Ligand binder design. Structure first.
Ligand SMILES: [Ca+2]
Ligand SMILES: [Ca+2]
Lengths: 129, 123
């Protein structure tokens, strides 16, 4: 059973929101909507279909993407260890928006393929409980 | 002190190529151009400015690979709900770093993309 306006699939309740927020804010927002809420996690094909269709119902734009609950924990800009020449990384010149450690799905792939995005972008999302 | 077709800077030798290759092929290519040659690496801003000025002056505007690949493949990817990661649907497998001959800022792009590049080795 799910709260009014939430949809269910395999014992879980899902909900798409049009309001745009950063990845961290969406996650935080989802925790406050329902106990145990988080950004959706996709653990199978079946769930991928359900979620893709769920999203497609409310989100019609391609100007933005939809946040999903997968993200790189590391605080560094990259996780490898060295350059191809073997030397270590001891100087970076990254463009903030260029480090894409949060994932989202876009309309162009039918909201299925996981694409990398800069975590601070404001975008719609989906909560799962 | 570098071969005539290469440019020097602080004991190093650099050379830009405009043969469109993906990251893996680019690196491998650089290794057979000279001993100890690899895709360029940046240890400072002065060096980066140097290579940029060099790449632009030679082939004008374009994108050039840097010696960094699979930058997030080893990161700790996790579901915020603590679900274990088994199912997968990555749009792109690996991401590599490149820079525009216009400025020295590091940029991201899938490693299977085709771009130009700069090779380097210790003189
Ligand atoms: Ca799930
Ligand atoms: Ca170097």
């Amino acid at each position: 059973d799910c709260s009014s306006s939430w949809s269910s699939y395999e014992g879980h309740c899902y909900k798409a929101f049009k309001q745009s927020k950063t990845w961290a804010d969406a996650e935080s927002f989802c925790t406050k909507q329902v106990n145990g809420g988080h950004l959706v996690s996709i653990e199978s094909s079946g769930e991928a279909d359900f979620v893709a269709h769920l999203i497609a119902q409310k989100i019609k734009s391609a100007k933005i993407h939809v946040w999903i609950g997968l993200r790189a924990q590391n605080k560094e800009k990259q996780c490898s260890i060295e350059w191809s020449d073997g030397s270590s990384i001891s100087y970076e010149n990254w463009i903030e928006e260029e480090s894409k450690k949060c994932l989202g799905v876009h309309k162009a792939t039918g909201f299925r393929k996981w694409e990398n995005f800069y975590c601070e972008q404001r975008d719609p999302f989906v909560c799962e409980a | 002190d570098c071969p005539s077709d290469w440019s020097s800077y602080e004991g190093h030798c650099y050379k830009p190529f405009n043969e469109p290759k993906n990251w893996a092929d680019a690196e491998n290519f650089c290794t057979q151009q000279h001993t100890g040659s690899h895709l360029v690496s940046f240890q400072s801003t002065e060096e980066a400015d140097f290579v940029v000025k060099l790449a632009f002056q030679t082939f004008d505007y374009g994108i050039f690979w840097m010696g960094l690949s699979k930058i997030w493949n080893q990161c700790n990817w996790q579901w915020s709900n603590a679900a274990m990661l088994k199912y997968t649907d990555w749009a792109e497998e690996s991401y590599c770093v490149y820079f525009k001959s216009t400025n020295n800022k590091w940029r991201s792009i899938t490693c299977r993309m085709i771009a130009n590049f700069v090779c380097e080795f210790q003189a």
